[PDB]
Amino acid sequence: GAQVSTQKTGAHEIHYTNVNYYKDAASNSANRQDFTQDPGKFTEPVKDIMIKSMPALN
Amino acid sequence: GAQVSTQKTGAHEIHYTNVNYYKDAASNSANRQDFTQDPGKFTEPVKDIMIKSMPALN
Amino acid sequence: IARVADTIGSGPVNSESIPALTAAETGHTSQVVPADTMQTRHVKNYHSRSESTVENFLCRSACVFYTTYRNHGTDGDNFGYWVISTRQVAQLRRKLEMFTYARFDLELTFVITSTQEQSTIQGQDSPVLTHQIMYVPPGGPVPTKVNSYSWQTSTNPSVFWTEGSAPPRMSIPFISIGNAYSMFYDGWAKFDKQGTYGINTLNNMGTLYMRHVNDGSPGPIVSTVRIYFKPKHVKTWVPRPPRLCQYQKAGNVNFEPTGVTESRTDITTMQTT
Amino acid sequence: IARVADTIGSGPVNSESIPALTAAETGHTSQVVPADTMQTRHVKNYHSRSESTVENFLCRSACVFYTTYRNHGTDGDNFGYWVISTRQVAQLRRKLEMFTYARFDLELTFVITSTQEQSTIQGQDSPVLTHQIMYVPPGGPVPTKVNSYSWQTSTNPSVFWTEGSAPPRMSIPFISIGNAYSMFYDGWAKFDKQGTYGINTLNNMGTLYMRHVNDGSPGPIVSTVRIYFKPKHVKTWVPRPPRLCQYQKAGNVNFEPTGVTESRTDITTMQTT
Amino acid sequence: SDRVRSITLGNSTITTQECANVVVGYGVWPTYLNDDEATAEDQPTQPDVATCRFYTLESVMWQQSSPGWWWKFPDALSNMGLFGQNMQYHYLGRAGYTVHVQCNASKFHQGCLLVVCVPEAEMGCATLANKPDQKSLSNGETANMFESQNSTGQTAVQANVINAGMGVGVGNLTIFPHQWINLRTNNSATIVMPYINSVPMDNMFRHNNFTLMIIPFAPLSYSTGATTYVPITVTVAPMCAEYNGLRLAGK
Amino acid sequence: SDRVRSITLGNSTITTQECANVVVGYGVWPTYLNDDEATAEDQPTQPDVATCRFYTLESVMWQQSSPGWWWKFPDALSNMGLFGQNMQYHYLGRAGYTVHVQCNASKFHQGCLLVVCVPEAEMGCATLANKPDQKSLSNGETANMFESQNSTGQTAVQANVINAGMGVGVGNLTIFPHQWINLRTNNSATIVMPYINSVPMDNMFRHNNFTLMIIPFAPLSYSTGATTYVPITVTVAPMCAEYNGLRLAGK
Ligand SMILES: CCCCCCCCCCCCCCCC(=O)O
Numbered sequence A, B: 001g002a003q004v005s006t007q008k009t010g011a012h013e014i015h016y017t018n019v020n021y022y023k024d025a026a027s028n029s030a031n032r033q034d035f036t037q038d039p040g041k042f043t044e045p046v047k048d049i050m051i052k053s054m055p056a057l058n
Numbered sequence C, D: 001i002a003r004v005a006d007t008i009g010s011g012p013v014n015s016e017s018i019p020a021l022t023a024a025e026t027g028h029t030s031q032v033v034p035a036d037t038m039q040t041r042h043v044k045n046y047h048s049r050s051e052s053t054v055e056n057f058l059c060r061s062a063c064v065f066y067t068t069y070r071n072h073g074t075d076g077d078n079f080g081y082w083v084i085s086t087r088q089v090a091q092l093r094r095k096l097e098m099f100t101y102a103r104f105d106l107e108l109t110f111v112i113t114s115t116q117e118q119s120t121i122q123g124q125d126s127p128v129l130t131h132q133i134m135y136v137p138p139g140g141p142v143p144t145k146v147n148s149y150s151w152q153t154s155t156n157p158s159v160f161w162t163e164g165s166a167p168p169r170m171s172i173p174f175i176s177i178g179n180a181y182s183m184f185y186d187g188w189a190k191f192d193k194q195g196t197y198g199i200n201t202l203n204n205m206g207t208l209y210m211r212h213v214n215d216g217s218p219g220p221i222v223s224t225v226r227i228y229f230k231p232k233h234v235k236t237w238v239p240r241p242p243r244l245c246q247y248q249k250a251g252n253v254n255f256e257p258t259g260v261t262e263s264r265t266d267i268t269t270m271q272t273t
Numbered sequence E, F: 001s002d003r004v005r006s007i008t009l010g011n012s013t014i015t016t017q018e019c020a021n022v023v024v025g026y027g028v029w030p031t032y033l034n035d036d037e038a039t040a041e042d043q044p045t046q047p048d049v050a051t052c053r054f055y056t057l058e059s060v061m062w063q064q065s066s067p068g069w070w071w072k073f074p075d076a077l078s079n080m081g082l083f084g085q086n087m088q089y090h091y092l093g094r095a096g097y098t099v100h101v102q103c104n105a106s107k108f109h110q111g112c113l114l115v116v117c118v119p120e121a122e123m124g125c126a127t128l129a130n131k132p133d134q135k136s137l138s139n140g141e142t143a144n145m146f147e148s149q150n151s152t153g154q155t156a157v158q159a160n161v162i163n164a165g166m167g168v169g170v171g172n173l174t175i176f177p178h179q180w181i182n183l184r185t186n187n188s189a190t191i192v193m194p195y196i197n198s199v200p201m202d203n204m205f206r207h208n209n210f211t212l213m214i215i216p217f218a219p220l221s222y223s224t225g226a227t228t229y230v231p232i233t234v235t236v237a238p239m240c241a242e243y244n245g246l247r248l249a250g251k
């Protein structure tokens, strides 16, 4: 049970291996590459869709 | 994910193994065997081909 | 990949569409890009947001407290204790308090250093020192002396460490009784609202106890233990504005009123700063 | 394989082809081999250019600075700092400056050594020392005392090290805001051309801070930290002539004019040297 | 033959009947910045004819004791037509250059000039503690002269030619794209320089970042009765010039 | 709705929440000169971003007794950024214009302005024997004011507004591409003008050849206690500007 993942490399011109040693999931290392984004919660929390090009208010 | 490469040995009369441990590509070891050569940039930067046996200037 | 958006090409426009005009009263933050108010070129942006994730922003070891204990004591009374909290330091407290709720595992690290004290007990040749940090969860028996029975650690987790070696480290899971750690609490502890008000209501994490496992030598010695917290496997909820005023207490959010920003000469001075 | 070219066999010649004659005015460097101006034999050359690659030429640990800090201080004021640069040493500066642009990762290593000072504080029996190197990027809060709050290192990267163990080492990626590190800059910092001229314009790497994590003991002690840089994953552009004159400053390329080479007696003396 | 050559850029043309060849940078012809290399988002300006054309600088006079000259670019073109204009109104810029140095003699004249383009040619001051002032580094359209002796001055440049103002060996300058004007062989030298920098575009007023040096390695020589006025004319043309960041004019 | 509108040219944008519509010349959108219409042979310059953008002129103040104003183009833009620069270095030029006149009021204000672009607006002098001097015809970025009475002066323009300086009926000026700013209806007027001339390109310094007139047909009016400072701002943008005939700068 070894996990081969992709290292953090540069763009515009590379794997590491991981084995878990302990029985608890808290003993693992950090989730350094959990890239998720949902900004709509805070920037567009309104009920109606509010298209950009249209006027906000009639 | 283990990489078996050829060691540096002598010519005229031999592998090592590599595993990456860290998540960043900068944590890796040096590229000791990146043998590339393009001397034409500095020694023949002229526009025309300039064949050797021919006279350089007419 | 936390890759940012590419810039799209845009030429001249003349139409009824009004991307620049909006109503900020709606609470909606406008989604205008530079390609809406000017002719842009095409840019393949390879920049990524990998460093502003909440895991990377928070996964840094930070010192949260240090205390001192001696080898001679009286009588004694030469040991250390810390009631665990994350609010006695300014730096880590402000990062954790950018959110209202957080769930994470911790990486706990200790840095124990010993110092020789002024005396006339020459000559001193002291063997290597061994320290014992004991964690007593809420309700367990507390050490009263430096050699009391509680240090047996039959069920209480303890780490023994000899000086000169790597600083000790262990992992702690998410241990709260709630579904998330609270950085902020807007209620009281008692139902009649008398007593403690605020985040101190939920502070029941426990206590750490430190001592020398060695018997005290003639030469006086004082050791200081630095605790370092590192959040791991983080999940944050409800971000809030960063603390502007300087902290005053650990139990409450009491502050001294502060200006909004640094002032400048007038409304048009470009010397900012 | 960076294997050199084999020598081809060549017999006598009598023709119109003139490999030895050329025009050096063209800027072209002639590609004549020995097989063009003499009868050669066939040689299977197994020599390789593996050692003159820019990675191998540059991937050597080099000391770039060392500074001292004490344990007593006043008041204190017993800690060290270094504004990071690669131009305070002659040896590594001349290798990096054979190119105009370079991109690489670094391997950073420290060698910390402590020395006992002259005093009459007998007798001294001091526990092992622990050092803390903190890196403060540009804009971050600076340590003002040896025990100030900045040493908490909530977000600033720091390495803790106890004496007697392996020298500490960590990797740094390529961190510049440009697409390449510049060894040379032929402009000013301000648009009106007043102010700093040259490579100092682009020097904004940060600062390192060092201290003893231990409380000071009675016996005086001075520690020196040696920083070692090792370029990794190298890419170089636009090679330039090696520095001939001895360096004078770190911020600029100011020099004292030097002769082209060592002189000899006359145009025909074979005693060279 | 290969000694003749013509170069047409814009409404300008240069003919040469006695040349050697064209040296093209590091084998790279100048091009426009691509979408995957760009970082500035606004649509750039490309005049493409009014700016990418030949400009002739001020001529110097080769003498028997001339150590050499140097120009900074694009500071030398900062007042040349519409190329200088776009430089003033824009924050960012980008160009490559065709450089044509021209010196003719009488076939009884002798002397060899080194013509080289040095990228990022940072120059030292004559006083080790100080820095060279703005005029000593680049006089614009006028050449700054090398000296054949140690320089003096608080803000002066160390213009002793043996180190070429940079603290290197002057004979080692052939690592950069260079050429030779040898009076018995050719009367001109031409170099095509691409845009070289650590960023895709730069401010054209606070950065150069290449210098043109003309150093006589073999001195000018002739017998009495021959023409003694041998000038060297420099004609540069920006190639693929584009500009970003339009605003009020300056500097 | 159709009262809102935005116009993006270059790095500039104009939003209007209360407009009427866009008047496009004679139904012709400005374009570049074609190969079968061109006669000048050299490759033209097209800045296309640094010049085809919005420029704001100097504002005037609408008063209760203001007869009107006029600008000449491209003389009004002869000193505006890189558009004026390309005009100086080039013999020939060619552009179309987006014109945006903007005047806002308080909804208790009243008055109607005629905004018209007159092609080839040749103006007469106040003295019948003489000719109007250069400044009376076009002050550049500054507006020349109509009079509500007969003008006097040897070199003056006959600026009596009833004939509009041209010897015609001012109410008949609606034959040209025009619009109205009626304070109860809209606060702006925009006209897109193509290049109109008897030749494919012309010299931009000795020919205009259209004028912008702003004539209040209904005077400004308000009750005491309201704002009395009602300015009119003019924002013009050349479209598809190209240039031929590069040489030294002038005028
Ligand atoms: C031998 C060492 C064991 C020590 C175990 C320590 C466990 C204590 C719990 C630490 C987590 C506290 C986090 C609280 C967060 C908050 O209040 O915002």
Ligand SMILES: CCCCCCCCCCCCCCCC(=O)O
Residues within 6 Å of the ligand: D084, D086, D096, D106, D108, D133, D134, D135, D157, D158, D159, D170, D172, D175, D181, D182, D183, D205, D206
């Ligand atoms: C705890 C240790 C962390 C230290 C991190 C140090 C990072 C500083 C950056 C080093 C690279 C500098 C290279 C510059 C090259 C040049 O200017 O030519």
Ligand SMILES: CCCCCCCCCCCCCC(=O)O
Residues within 6 Å of the ligand: A001, A002, A017, A018, A019, B019, B020, B021
């Ligand atoms: C961090 C790099 C770890 C390198 C691997 C060392 C640990 C032992 C690996 C054993 C792999 C077989 C176990 C398995 O089946 O998953």
Ligand SMILES: CCCCCCCCCCCCCC(=O)O
Residues within 6 Å of the ligand: A002, A004, A017, B001, B002, B017, B018, B019
């Ligand atoms: C430098 C030599 C390293 C020798 C190997 C030790 C590390 C563990 C190897 C584990 C191999 C299985 C992992 C994988 O699937 O790639």
